[PDB]
Design a protein around this nucleic acid. Structure first.
Lengths: 135, 74, 88, 70, 64
RNA sequence: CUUGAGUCUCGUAGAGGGGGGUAGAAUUCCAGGUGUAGCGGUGAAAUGCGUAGAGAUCUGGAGGAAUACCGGUGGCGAAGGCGGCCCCCUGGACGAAGACUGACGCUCAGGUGCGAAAGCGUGGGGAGCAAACAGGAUUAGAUACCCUGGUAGUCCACGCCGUAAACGAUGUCGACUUGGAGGUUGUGCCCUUGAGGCGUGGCUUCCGGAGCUAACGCGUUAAGUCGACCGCCUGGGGAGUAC
C-alpha cells in the first residue's frame, strides 16, 4: 500500500491514558486492512521550547502501512482532540519502510538515550492487559 | 583488487549515507550551533546532497520540538 | 503516469499476444487512458498551467501517432479509433 | 557577543568580533533597507569576483617565482 | 548612562546582576563594562537581539 | 531495415505546478503589572509621541503578511518564474541494462496557449511597507533628496488588456572541431584504505587554443565549420507616433 511514519505526542495529564489511544488507532488501521510495522513509544520528554504553555509531552511513533483514506481519517480525529499536543505524518510510497529501518532506532534509544524514569511508566499503565493464559 | 569493497570509514565526513535522518539526535546536534541553528556545508564538510537532506531532517526535528528552534530563553 | 498494474492491462488488451511496448495502437491507448485520468485532474485543478503543458504534449503526441497509423493500416486505424471511443 | 557560556565571571580579554555567531555583520542586513528583491544579482553575485581574487593570489605566487620578483 | 542608573537602584540594595543586551548600536558591550566597574557582579551577558525569520518588510530608506 | 524519433519495467535529484493544513522568530495592535522623564529622529535638526504616565520592561490575547540559519558559481523550470514544514493530486528530465514499434522526423505564416510588474473589475482582507497626500528640514527655490505620519496598492478568490533592459541584449533542432580547472547528479571497477586511484553519461561554471569578429570578445553550452525551416533589418530626426 503506502507507508506512513506517524509521530504524535500527547499532553501529560491525558498521557496516562495513551495505550488506549494507540489501541483505538491500531485497530482502526488494521481494521482498514493496514499493518503496524511498529509501535515504539518514546516516553515522556522535555520539550525543546514550550508549546502553548506546556513544558513536557509524551511521544509515540506508529509506523502504519495503509491506504490514503485511512491516514486521512486519523488526522480528523487528531485535529479535534485535546489530547494530542502536536502531530506529524511523514512520507507515502517507500518500500524501505516495510523492512523497518527504525527497528535499530528503537534499540539505539534503549541502549543509551531512553532509561528508567517515573513518567513513562505512568503513561503505560492504563492499557494493562491480562487476556492471554490457557484455561 | 577484486570485490573486498570498502571496509574503511574515514572519507568526506559522509562515507556512510547518513540513513537514520531525524531520529539520531546526537548526530544532528553536531551540525547545530550553541545558538540553535544549522551550520553551513563548507564548515561541516558534508556533501551537498546529504546537506540538503540533513537540513530537511533538522527542520522536521525543530517542528517536532526535538531540537531548539532558536536558543531563545533556553 | 498511468498505474503499473493498469498499464499491464492496457498493453495486454491493445497489444498482440507478444506483449509489445512500442506498437502504435498500444501507445495511443496508453496516452488516451492518461488523458482521461488527467481530464479528471484538471476538473479540480483549473489553474494548473505547468501540468497542462504536459497534457498538450500528450494530446499532440497522440495526434501524431494517429497520423502515422492512418498512413499505414487504415483498417487498424478505423478499428482503433472506435474501440477507444475517439472523436464523433 | 562576549559569549554567555564561556564560564560565568567577567574576564575582559574576550574580543567580541572573535566571539560572534553571526550578530551585526550580516544579521542586521534587514534594517534601514529592504535589499530590493533582485538587487542581490549585483550585490551578492560578486561571488565570482571574490573567487577570482583568490585565484589571482594563487596565480601571483607562481609568476613571482619564474620572474624572480625579488 | 549605566553609572547614573546604578545610583537609582542603590535604594533596592541590589548586589548581583544579569544583563540582557539588545540591538546593533554602539555602547552594546561598553555599557556592560561600566556595570562591572560599578561594583556589580554580572551573571551572564545574554545578547537577546530580536531577529525576524525573514518576516515583515523593512522600510527602504536612503532611496534611488 | 534501425543509429533517428517514440515506448515499457527499476531507480534518482530538485524552491516544477496546483489544493488543503500547520509551526516558530519578529514588526504591530488591544489588554493588564512594574516604572520615570524624555522618547523618536539626523549631518545637526524639527514635525511627532510624552507628565492624560511615553520610551524601555514582564505577562496574556488578537490579527496579517513573510518563512531566518540551511542557501552554494547550487537546483528545478518552455520562458516569465519558483526557497518553512506536512499530506493530496500531477508535469518534465536523467540514468543502467534488457525489450519493443520502425522515419512516426525537424521547422512553422495564419493560428490557439502560457505574465515579472504595476494597472484593472467584482468580492474578501489589511500586520508590515508605501506612490498620491500632509507636516517638518535643507535650498536662492526644492512640487525632489532626508525625517514624522499615511491612502490606493501589495495579500487571497475569480475574470481582463499580455507589458519588460520579457537577456546570454545570442531563434529553433542536428552533425562536426585540441583542452584545462571547478560545481552538481545518475553510474561501472578498486586491499574501494591518503575528503584517494581508474571508467561512463546528464546538466553547469570560470579560464583558454585553432578559427572567426571592425574591435571588444566568443571559443566544443561558439560569435568556429556547416545543414534545414522561421522571424527581422535597410541612414539619423520625425516614429513605434498619426490616420
Amino acid at each position: 500500500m503506502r507507508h506512513y511514519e506517524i509521530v504524535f505526542m500527547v499532553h501529560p495529564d491525558q498521557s496516562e491514558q495513551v495505550p488506549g489511544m494507540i489501541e483505538r488507532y491500531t485497530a482502526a488501521i488494521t481494521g482498514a486492512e493496514g499493518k503496524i510495522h511498529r509501535l515504539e513509544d518514546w516516553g515522556r520528554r522535555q520539550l525543546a521550547y514550550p508549546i502553548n504553555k506546556l513544558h513536557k509531552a509524551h511521544y509515540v511513533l506508529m509506523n502504519v502501512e495503509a491506504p490514503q483514506e485511512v491516514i486521512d481519517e486519523l488526522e480528523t480525529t487528531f485535529r479535534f482532540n485535546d489530547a494530542v499536543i502536536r502531530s506529524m505524518v511523514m512520507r507515502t510510497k517507500h518500500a524501505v519502510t516495510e523492512a523497518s529501518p527504525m527497528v535499530k532506532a528503537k534499540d539505539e534509544r534503549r541502549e543509551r538515550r531512553d532509561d528508567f524514569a517515573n513518567e513513562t511508566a505512568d503513561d503505560a499503565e492504563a492499557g494493562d492487559s491480562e487476556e492471554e493464559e490457557e484455561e | 583488487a577484486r570485490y573486498f569493497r570498502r571496509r574503511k570509514f574515514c572519507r568526506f565526513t559522509a562515507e556512510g549515507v547518513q540513513e537514520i535522518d531525524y531520529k539520531d539526535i546526537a548526530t544532528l546536534k553536531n551540525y547545530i550551533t550553541e545558538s540553535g541553528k544549522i551550520v553551513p556545508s563548507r564548515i561541516t564538510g558534508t556533501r551537498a546532497k546529504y546537506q540538503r537532506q540533513l537540513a530537511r531532517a533538522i527542520k522536521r526535528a525543530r517542528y517536532l520540538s526535538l531540537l531548539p528552534y532558536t536558543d531563545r530563553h533556553q | 503516469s498511468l498505474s503499473t498494474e493498469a498499464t499491464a492491462k492496457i498493453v495486454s488488451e491493445f497489444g498482440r499476444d507478444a506483449n509489445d511496448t512500442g506498437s502504435t495502437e498500444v501507445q495511443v491507448a496508453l496516452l488516451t487512458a492518461q488523458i482521461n485520468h488527467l481530464q479528471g485532474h484538471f476538473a479540480e485543478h483549473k489553474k494548473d498551467h505547468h501540468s497542462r503543458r504536459g497534457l498538450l504534449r500528450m494530446v499532440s503526441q497522440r495526434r501524431k501517432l494517429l497520423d502515422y497509423l492512418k498512413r499505414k493500416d487504415v483498417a487498424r486505424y478505423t478499428r482503433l479509433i472506435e474501440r477507444l471511443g475517439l472523436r464523433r | 557577543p562576549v559569549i554567555k557560556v564561556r564560564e560565568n565571571e567577567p574576564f575582559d580579554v574576550a574580543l567580541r568580533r572573535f566571539k560572534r555567531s553571526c550578530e551585526k555583520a550580516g544579521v542586521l542586513a534587514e534594517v534601514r533597507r529592504r535589499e530590493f528583491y533582485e538587487k542581490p544579482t549585483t550585490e551578492r553575485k560578486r561571488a565570482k569576483a571574490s573567487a577570482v581574487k583568490r585565484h589571482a593570489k594563487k596565480l601571483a605566487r607562481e609568476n613571482a617565482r619564474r620572474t624572480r620578483l625579488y | 548612562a549605566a553609572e547614573r542608573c546604578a545610583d537609582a537602584v542603590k535604594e533596592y540594595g541590589i548586589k548581583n546582576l544579569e544583563v540582557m543586551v539588545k540591538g546593533p548600536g554602539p555602547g552594546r558591550e561598553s555599557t556592560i563594562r561600566a556595570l562591572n566597574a560599578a561594583g556589580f557582579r554580572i551573571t551572564n551577558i545574554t545578547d537577546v537581539t530580536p531577529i525576524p525569520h525573514n518576516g515583515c518588510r523593512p522600510p527602504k530608506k536612503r532611496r534611488v
